[PDB]
Amino acid sequence: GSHMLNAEDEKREEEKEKQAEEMASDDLSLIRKNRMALFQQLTCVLPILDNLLKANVINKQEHDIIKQKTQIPLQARELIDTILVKGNAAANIFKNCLKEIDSTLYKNLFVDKNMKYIPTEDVSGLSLEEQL
């Protein structure tokens, strides 16, 4: 016997699975820091979703659910959540997707290490009944 079997379903299913902190490379820090930028500046949540859907924990169900009645902002939120679960393991897929989808973006993300910011949340245009 290579190893002895040990019960875990006794009391651990409810608890969240432990992530490999050791694996967590620096790239993870960059992704986490650029997390707001990605959510705040999204324009390719589809392309990346397609690439991730190729090989991930989500099947045709979870993928369809976020494609059933979910807008675009939420789609990005769920996609980000999938990265956290996978961890640095998905950093490669995430990075690979951006490189292919937007090679130029990579040259400004990891390379330049300087992400641009824009107040997209700030909007204006109130008019209950203009008649002037």
Side-chain angles (χ1 to χ4, degrees), residues 39-107:
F39 171 72
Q40 185 174 306
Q41 302 160 55
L42 74 97
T43 145
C44 45
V45 181
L46 271 156
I48 187 168
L49 178 57
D50 192 349
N51 289 308
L52 181 62
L53 180 61
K54 185 177 181 180
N56 46 186
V57 301
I58 57 174
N59 64 118
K60 63 185 185 299
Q61 290 290 296
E62 276 66 17
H63 185 268
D64 183 354
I65 290 168
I66 61 178
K67 198 174 178 65
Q68 202 182 48
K69 290 181 182 178
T70 306
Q71 295 178 296
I72 329 299
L74 280 289
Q75 187 67 203
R77 189 87 65 191
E78 280 66 89
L79 176 58
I80 290 169
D81 276 357
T82 57
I83 305 305
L84 181 60
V85 174
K86 291 181 176 63
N88 48 86
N92 51 357
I93 292 275
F94 187 81
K95 288 169 67 164
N96 293 327
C97 297
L98 292 175
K99 285 175 179 292
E100 296 294 341
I101 294 169
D102 287 341
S103 164
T104 313
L105 178 57
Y106 176 80
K107 199 175 180 180

Side-chain angles (χ1 to χ4, degrees), residues 23-37:
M23 298 294 277
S25 175
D26 57 350
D27 288 343
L28 182 63
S29 299
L30 275 291
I31 294 168
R32 289 174 63 188
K33 288 179 180 181
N34 307 168
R35 184 176 64 184
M36 298 178 69

